[PDB]
Design a protein. Structure first.
Lengths: 233, 196, 195, 204, 211, 222, 226, 195, 196
């Protein structure tokens, strides 16, 4: 049993017709202090998987090392390591899910919420969640922390059920994710303007975008707001 | 919350962020924490929103009644009324208030009233959760008898840093200029102050 | 205090109350009468926390006796039981509630019927053919459920009561030092001196 | 410890075609111990019926209180109180004890004597009004009653059909609740006749 | 829960209700609280269903290997003792068991009470569970050694009924067993709802209840 | 302090027919007042004509099912591809559950299939392994809403034959699979109305001598 | 609970869902969360249901007496001030979380009130367990210079977000529009996207199914003449 | 369990132990023998938490019986009492201590003297002419302090024991259901079947 | 405690105050919080004095053994050893450490290791109770590729403010300069840095 110290906030994601999108801001908070501004919380595994992590950053860095070691170990005595016997999103997820549940069962958890996004060998989209309790679930849209409360409602307006996935393009899906990140910057007190975004497509592969910023923000209406009720000046 | 009041040559300027939080949720991102208790006596509010509103409303009532009987009250008098409420009800209140005002005789004055209900008259004052991160910056950069433009820049730069580091602070930077010329409201948006 | 029982038969109400008073590991008395006569044809037994019990019982007694003098008329057992219930329902939301459970046994001279009321400290009133407070009913209700008839004689009611007490004396860990038994009927209230 | 489940009990009400029905169990207990099988929880003030679940001392107290208030209402107004008006009186009376409340779950049922419209309503222990079109439930088997009513109920039932529906809702809910049962009563209410029926049920 | 068992002239009667509770919610009304350890040995369950079920089924397996090793059926005393020592290891750990081990061995009919606290008591009459207190009244008043099998079966049945009526956490149905030197005999499942009304009419009891 | 348990909501229902059995469950997964998934399967085909659902804390439910599927696999290896009977599976599951008596699987488990005589079978489990065969059983969040309805409509409880007035009960006539699925759908539709953790979808697994079949029905998404 | 408030060109609109819960159970499927303080001052309430009802009826009563005393139509700031001072006095124990809106001789107004007595001003607001789902919609689609039709759409879309994504919210959407120079229109059940489907079976019983012990006529009439 | 007494007279040791076993509000048995014969001339009575009592007593019994067989010799009461004390002093600092208090009554055939030892669950041993565990001694010690002589006969010891029990039955709130009495002397151990 | 490490053109400079406290009592006013784990790899210590000493001693042992086998370790390697201890024993430790070192290949490098045991490579880092008060000042005044004299002034001014506002910080300002030229120790007394 511990408490989280340096933390990362929401990770958000969704499926679209040819793949998946995932995003997360670049902040490492220390309670109410916005301490570390250059923290990458999306970690690619090969060219077909991206693991997005929220929660304790020290435990994130530990998981990041486990994944790096997993790739090394998979290549051992494996001539098809870059082909048929490469790591799949489903393999990577089940491994983490196994680790998370085992750690909670020893009353010493990895204080994280994780979303594994990727595309399988057969072109199928993979998107599944796991957390410190070992709880797992899958949905067309997935989000952690505040994203669950604010992002999911917006992303579910695009993909409300399974049948909406083929009807959703990459441009529409990215637009929805970027909008959600803006909303989280308006409303989450432990968020940052700077974020990373990753697209895993079955045709165009893995596209990893860094140093993105929330833009097209609405603040001008603030000038007209005066006092808390009766004040006019 | 990041609030400050700074005296300068022509008077005094109040400054504040616009963020109100319930834990990590931002309940209001365009809050007005600079509130008027008299024509040229304003206050900055930090702590409980309900407590500080209830106090400021009572003070505005007292000073309105003072004015009807004895004419325009001094900034010191306004600070005393705030103090009396904050001190006598210290067990039940969570309010950190900065009182700032302009007289023609006394010019610009700033009084800070922390949690206990004590009063401290200062050349400038900072308060709120975000003030912790700018004690060094403000102490190094503050000068007496600054110009209006210099003081606006000083507050802008200071609150910019407070917002950058404090999660409980954010949104727009509101300011209120108190001089003989009158009362001027200023606003500065994220795109402006973040790039400083 | 510990065990208080009540049974309404054909023409009377029988109340059985334990004799023991206890303070910690010591029995202070073995002949305590846990009852007050509220009126000539109404008897109230009681049990609960020390002090509260007697203070409440005597307070009720004084009020009913005052009513009797003022009107030169005896209140019905139903009216008394309702007065008592209101006092307890008033008590439960007070600064320090009376921690007392009572049984009210009375003979209504107007209807020519015996009546038994069970009232707990919350002000929960119920009219019954037989009743008990605390852990008493747990041992005795199975026998009463089996043997009770509404046309029983007073002697048959006493025999069924002996059976209930015998079961208590076998299975209860606490020694309550026997019971004082009182019968309420048309001719008033009397004590069974041999039980 | 929980005041609302010491004594146990349930109340359910339903609307029908030009009729209402209200029903309750007869149990009064002290937690696991069953004390009385004759503790009726439905009272009436003129043509307005009130069922009350929860702490038995408060059930008895509130009945005596609403009898008091409705009798004064009638003396001054020179008419019997109506269900809509009584519902507001119950709400007012409960909220006046906002921070020292009666631990009860009241249910109003009746037909407006002027309009002829069937009316039911439910309350929380502090006065919030739930004015439902279909049914109201209250008590220690409220979850059970919700499941039964939500599946068995259909609108515009005739009195003799409504009787069977509400009875089966009560009986089968009570038989899945340890603190309810020991008998049951059902009131069938029409504009100018009211029939009361005691149901035969398992006594455990 | 109400369970009882008593020794008498013609063996031992074993009776139990069938209710399982989860707070105020009635989870089940068809619980077998009597366990068949072996054709000459019975075990009752009270408190934790999982605990009683697991440890008594583990006991039956212990008793079986005893028979293979020793060419002899285990005694009621030895069986009860194995259980007691098994649960004693986990004392204070949170186990919740109230059981009776009933059978017929070389010493005649045998009846032992065993619980998770560590008690192991031999006796002619026991009743365990939340409703035991109601059952004891009917047992103690009507129990004799010179009881016929017919009357003894009724007594155990009537005693459960008394508890099922009053105790909110007891009810459903009555399961009856008779243990002889030729083995135990099951005497059926009896719905309390139907049984109550029948007993009320035939016996005259429960006058306070209307039917 | 770290709490190793959680509540993922969900409700399940098992009904045994004369020569069939159904195991139904909603597809909604939740924490507190949030929805995690509107379609997260909860009832599984475990092999040997046995279906299983472990409702409550999803992480413990997933682990138990995973372990039972594993137990079936090794039962074939160790005993010459012998079919695991429903009664044998039930006993095995008790030992899986009681192996964690002092750190329980926080789930209410139900399995369904056919007994060795070909008749429908449902078994119900508590979190620590107490089990019993049942004809009708609901588990999970809205179990208390559904079970009283099934007592009435499956076992005809408190129902008597008209004209006799309480003297003669309604006879226990068997139900078809089509009649059972109607009761399942009405149970979940009613539970959806009054329970916030129930909704989105309903997946039913039907077991016969021919095998395991699935049926899916939408539920309200509010 | 999801409640919202949205300002527009010539007025203000508020909206709410219709679900009431006790734990995981739904007590009322068609609850009315939109309250009338005065003819053109309405308020949506979240939190403890009896408290939002009681505090609204009280302030509305005092607002009516004030309007009669002053011979003026009531103002939103009056209702705002009276509510916050009442709630502040009870230090949060009265669990009323309100969105107060209306039109008066001063113009159109929109405020929020919390249980401890703090008020906030805005062009768009949201309260309750579904406020985050609703605020996500408002932050995505709100703009300056909205028309009446656009504002009703935005408000109901915000409530729907709560209905679908928050388990504490559900059933129907209620709306009230307060436009300057007009009567306030209260649109009860503006949307109804959660009608229950037809049941597979009818559970109407044969008459005589239930066992009965006794029957009797209940005397509801008064004591009769003669 | 509840009351265990012991008195050493001229030529014997008398142990009196209560018969009741209780689980909550119910008396499970009223004929329980709270004693084990450790050797032909050594008897140990015991009282404490359920399970611990019998488990410990039978564990001690098995060890002394093993010693007897191995050496073909009976240990002195003093040697037995010391063995028991060490087991309890070992127990008190263990993960889960035995919650048991004991009295050891024995006749030393070498010295031709009766001996009584009192040992509590901590491993506190004391040799006494008379002793008690729990709340027993509180009621009985004043009578024993008054009436006891070391030259008393067995019959005089039994009469003084009856007096002690009569006082317990009057002033103790709990019903312990009488006592089983056993005498340890040169001829071995026997039970008084009428008391 | 106020500690910082700053990279510059020629390498890296570590800085620290000298105050150790037991509540409000100053148990040591001339503490050396700049500690050596290798010839040109040093660390700044904050938190528990016992914990941070025990850690630094173990690290110095590991790097001494590393050197005997594999030659001079990198600053990253030293930071990794610190991390491994701080992360794996996070439940029982209270240590906030800044690791700073000079390579010829990698030049000046700074790694900060807060309470959780996470690692963060930065151009400069601040830590300790007193660091809170200079987040604004340091963020505004830090530049990359400063000169030795500029960096010494930056640390001096920064820690001067941290000491001024933090009661847990005080005494002398110690500094350690790490360059190709070697290892230089600097000290600055109250009379010097207070008047800044
Ligand atoms: B600021 O953070 O001090 C701010 C100033 C306030 C006057 C608008 N206060 C708040 O945001 C407080 C909580 C708080 C946060 C950080 C430090 C101290 C206090 N919030 C509220 O009072 C509040 C929140 N939600 C609804 C209503 N009121
Ligand atoms: B009985 O009441 O002791 C009964 C016996 C058990 C073998 C079925 N126990 C229970 O009903 C317990 C709760 C309880 C009630 C009263 C006293 C002690 C314990 N419940 C369960 O064992 C249980 C098991 N699975 C689901 C729900 N409840
Ligand atoms: B919403 O969730 O804020 C809603 C708004 C209300 C005005 C209808 N509140 C409720 O549904 C509350 C939730 C609640 C539950 C328990 C304590 C406090 C609040 N419900 C009720 O107030 C309620 C519950 N049962 C009956 C009547 N009212
Ligand atoms: B500094 O305050 O972090 C300082 C640095 C230490 C490495 C010399 N630590 C201390 O002074 C600590 C207590 C403390 C104060 C403020 C913040 C965190 C910790 N003191 C001790 O460890 C200590 C005190 N007295 C004797 C021994 N050790
Ligand atoms: Cl504010
Ligand atoms: Cl040190
Ligand atoms: Mg900020
Ligand atoms: Mg009572
Ligand atoms: Mg019942
Ligand atoms: Mg019962
Ligand atoms: Mg009962
Ligand atoms: Mg639903």
């Amino acid at each position: 049993t511990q408490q989280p110290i340096v933390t990362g906030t929401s990770v958000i994601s969704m499926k679209y017709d040819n793949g998946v999108i995932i995003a997360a801001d670049n902040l490492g908070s220390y309670g109410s202090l916005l301490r570390f501004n250059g923290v990458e919380r999306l970690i690619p595994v090969g060219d077909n998987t991206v693991v997005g992590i929220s929660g304790d950053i020290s435990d994130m860095q530990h998981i990041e090392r486990l994944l790096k070691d997993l790739v090394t170990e998979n290549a051992y005595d494996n001539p098809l390591a870059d082909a048929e016997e490469a790591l799949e999103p489903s393999y990577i997820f089940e491994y983490l899910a196994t680790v998370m549940y085992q750690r909670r069962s020893k009353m010493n958890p990895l204080w994280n919420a994780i979303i594994v996004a990727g595309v399988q060998s057969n072109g199928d989209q993979f998107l599944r969640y796991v957390n410190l309790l070992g709880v797992t679930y899958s949905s067309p849209t997935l989000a952690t922390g505040f994203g669950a409360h604010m992002a999911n409602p917006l992303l579910r307006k695009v993909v409300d059920r399974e049948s909406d996935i083929p009807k959703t393009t990459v441009q529409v899906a990215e637009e929805a994710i970027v909008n959600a990140m803006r909303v989280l910057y308006y409303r989450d007190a432990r968020s940052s303007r700077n974020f990373s975004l990753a697209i895993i497509d079955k045709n165009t592969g893995l596209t990893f975008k860094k140093n993105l910023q929330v833009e097209n923000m609405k603040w001008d209406f603030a000038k007209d707001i005066k006092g808390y009720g009766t004040q006019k000046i | 919350t990041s609030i400050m009041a700074v005296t300068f040559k022509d008077g005094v300027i109040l400054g504040a962020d616009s963020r109100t939080t319930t834990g990590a949720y931002i309940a209001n991102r365009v809050t007005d924490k600079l509130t008027r208790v008299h024509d040229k006596i304003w206050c900055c509010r930090s702590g409980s929103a309900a407590d500080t509103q209830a106090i400021a409303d009572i003070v505005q009532y007292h000073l309105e009644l003072y004015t009807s009987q004895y004419g325009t009250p001094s900034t010191e008098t306004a600070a005393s009324v705030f103090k009396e409420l904050c001190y006598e009800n210290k067990d039940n209140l969570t309010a950190g208030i900065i009182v700032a005002g302009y007289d023609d005789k006394n010019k610009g004055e700033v009084y800070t009233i922390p949690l206990g209900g004590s009063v401290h008259k200062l050349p400038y004052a900072i308060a709120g959760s975000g003030s912790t991160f700018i004690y060094g910056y403000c102490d190094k950069n503050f000068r007496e008898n600054m110009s209006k433009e210099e003081t606006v820049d000083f507050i802008k730069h200071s609150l910019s840093q407070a917002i950058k580091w404090d999660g409980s602070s954010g949104g727009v930077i509101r300011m209120v200029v108190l001089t003989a010329a009158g009362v001027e409201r200023l606003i500065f948006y994220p795109d402006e102050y973040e790039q400083l | 205090m510990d065990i208080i029982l009540g049974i309404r038969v054909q023409d009377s109400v029988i109340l059985a109350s334990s004799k023991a008073v206890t303070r910690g590991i010591s029995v202070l008395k073995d002949s305590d009468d846990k009852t007050r006569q509220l009126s000539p044809h109404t008897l109230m037994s009681f049990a609960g926390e020390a002090g509260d019990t007697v203070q409440f019982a005597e307070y009720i007694q004084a009020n009913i006796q005052l009513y009797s003098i003022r009107e030169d008329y005896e209140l019905s057992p139903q009216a008394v039981s309702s007065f008592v219930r209101q006092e307890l329902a008033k008590s439960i939301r007070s600064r320090r509630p009376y921690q007392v459970n009572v049984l009210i046994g009375g003979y209504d001279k107007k209807k020519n019927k015996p009546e038994l009321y069970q009232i707990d400290y919350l002000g929960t009133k119920v009219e019954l053919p037989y009743g008990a407070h605390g852990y008493s009913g747990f041992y005795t209700f199975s026998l009463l459920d089996h043997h009770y008839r509404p046309d029983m004689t007073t002697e048959e009611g006493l025999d069924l009561l002996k059976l209930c007490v015998q079961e208590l004396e076998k299975r209860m860990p606490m020694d309550f030092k026997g019971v004082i038994v009182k019968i309420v009927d048309k001719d008033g209230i009397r004590q069974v001196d041999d039980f | 410890s929980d005041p609302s489940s010491i004594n146990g009990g349930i109340v359910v009400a339903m609307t029908g075609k030009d009729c209402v029905a209200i029903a309750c169990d007869l149990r009064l207990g002290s937690q696991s111990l069953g004390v009385s099988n004759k503790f009726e929880k439905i009272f009436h003030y003129g043509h307005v019926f009130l069922g009350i679940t929860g702490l038995a001392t408060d059930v008895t107290t509130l009945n005596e209180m609403f009898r008091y208030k409705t009798n004064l209402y009638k003396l001054k107004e020179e008419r019997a109180i109506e269900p809509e008006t009584f519902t507001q009186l119950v709400s007012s009376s409960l909220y006046e004890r906002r921070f020292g409340p009666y631990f009860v779950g009241p249910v109003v049922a009746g037909i407006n004597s002027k309009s002829g419209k069937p009316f039911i309503a439910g309350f929380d222990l502090i006065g919030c009004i739930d004015e439902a079109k279909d049914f109201i439930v209250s008590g220690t088997a409220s979850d059970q009653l919700f499941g039964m009513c939500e599946s068995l109920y259909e609108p515009n039932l005739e009195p003799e059909d409504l009787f069977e529906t509400i009875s089966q809702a009560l009986l089968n809910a009570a038989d899945r609740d340890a603190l309810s049962g020991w008998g049951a009563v059902v009131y069938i209410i029409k504009k100018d006749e009211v029939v009361k029926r005691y149901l035969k049920m398992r006594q455990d | 829960t109400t369970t009882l068992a008593f020794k008498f002239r013609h063996g031992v009667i074993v009776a139990a209700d069938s209710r399982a509770t989860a707070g105020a919610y009635i989870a089940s009304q068809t619980v077998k609280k009597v366990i068949e350890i072996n054709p000459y040995l019975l075990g009752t369950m009270a408190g934790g269903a999982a605990d009683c079920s697991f440890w008594e089924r583990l006991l039956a397996r212990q008793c079986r290997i005893y028979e293979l090793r020793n060419k002899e059926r285990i005694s009621v005393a030895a069986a009860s003792k194995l259980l007691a020592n098994m649960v004693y290891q986990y004392k204070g750990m949170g186990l919740s068991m109230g059981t009776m081990i009933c059978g017929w061995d070389k010493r005649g009919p045998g009846l032992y009470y065993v619980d998770s606290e560590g008690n192991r008591i031999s006796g002619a009459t026991f009743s365990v569970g939340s409703g035991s207190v109601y059952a004891y009244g009917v047992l103690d008043s009507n129990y004799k050694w010179d009881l016929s099998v017919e009357d003894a079966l009724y007594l155990g049945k009537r005693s459960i009924l008394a508890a099922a009526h009053r105790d909110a956490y007891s009810g459903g149905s009555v399961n009856l067993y008779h243990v002889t030197e030729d083995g135990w005999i099951y005497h059926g499942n009896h719905d309390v709802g139907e049984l109550f009304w029948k007993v009320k009419e035939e016996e005259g009891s429960f006058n306070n209840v209307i039917g | 302090q770290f709490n190793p348990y959680g509540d993922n909501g969900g409700t399940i229902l098992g009904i045994a027919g004369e020569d069939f059995a159904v195991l139904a469950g909603d597809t909604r997964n939740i924490t507190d007042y949030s929805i995690n998934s509107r379609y997260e399967p909860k009832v599984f085909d475990c092999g040997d004509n046995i279906v299983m659902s472990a409702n409550g804390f999803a992480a413990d439910g997933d682990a138990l099912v995973k372990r039972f599927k594993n137990s079936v696999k090794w039962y074939h290896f160790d005993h010459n591809d012998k079919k695991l009977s429903i009664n044998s599976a039930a006993r095995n599951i008790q030992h899986l559950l009681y192996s964690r008596r002092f750190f329980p699987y926080y789930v209410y488990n139900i399995i369904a299939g056919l007994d060795e005589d070909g008749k429908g079978a449902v078994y119900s489990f508590d979190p620590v392994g107490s089990y019993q065969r049942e004809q009708c059983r609901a588990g999970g969040a809205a179990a208390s809403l559904i079970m009283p309805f099934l007592d009435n409509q499956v076992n005809f409880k408190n129902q008597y034959e008209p004209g006799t007035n309480g003297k003669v009960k309604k006879p226990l006539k068997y139900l078809s699979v089509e009649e059972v699925i109607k009761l399942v759908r009405d149970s979940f539709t009613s539970a959806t109305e009054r329970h916030i953790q129930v909704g989105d979808g309903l997946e039913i697994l039907i077991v016969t001598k021919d095998g395991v079949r699935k049926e899916f029905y939408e539920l309200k998404r509010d | 609970t999801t409640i919202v408030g949205v300002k527009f060109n010539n007025g203000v609109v508020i909206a709410a869902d219709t679900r009431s819960t006790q734990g995981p159970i739904v007590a009322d499927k068609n609850c009315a969360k939109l309250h009338r303080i005065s003819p053109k001052i309405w308020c949506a309430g979240a939190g403890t249901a009896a408290d939002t009802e009681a505090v609204t009826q009280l302030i509305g009563s005092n607002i009516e007496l004030h309007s009669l005393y002053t011979s003026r139509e009531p103002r939103v700031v009056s209702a705002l001030q009276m509510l916050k001072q009442h709630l502040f006095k009870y230090q949060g124990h009265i669990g009323a979380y309100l969105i107060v809106a209306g039109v008066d001789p001063t113009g159109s107004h929109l405020f929020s009130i919390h249980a401890h007595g703090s008020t906030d001003v805005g062009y768009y607001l949201s309260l309750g367990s579904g406020s985050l789902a609703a605020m996500a919609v408002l932050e995505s689609h709100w703009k300056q210079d909205l028309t009446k039709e656009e504002a009703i759409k935005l408000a109901s879309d915000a409530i729907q977000a709560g209905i679908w994504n928050d388990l504490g919210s559900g059933s129907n959407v209620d709306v009230c529009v307060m436009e300057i120079g007009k009567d306030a229109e209260y649109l009860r059940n503006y949307l109804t996207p959660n009608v229950r489907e037809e049941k597979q079976k009818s559970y109407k019983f044969p008459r005589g199914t239930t066992a009965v012990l006794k029957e009797s006529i209940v005397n509801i009439c008064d004591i009769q003449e003669e």
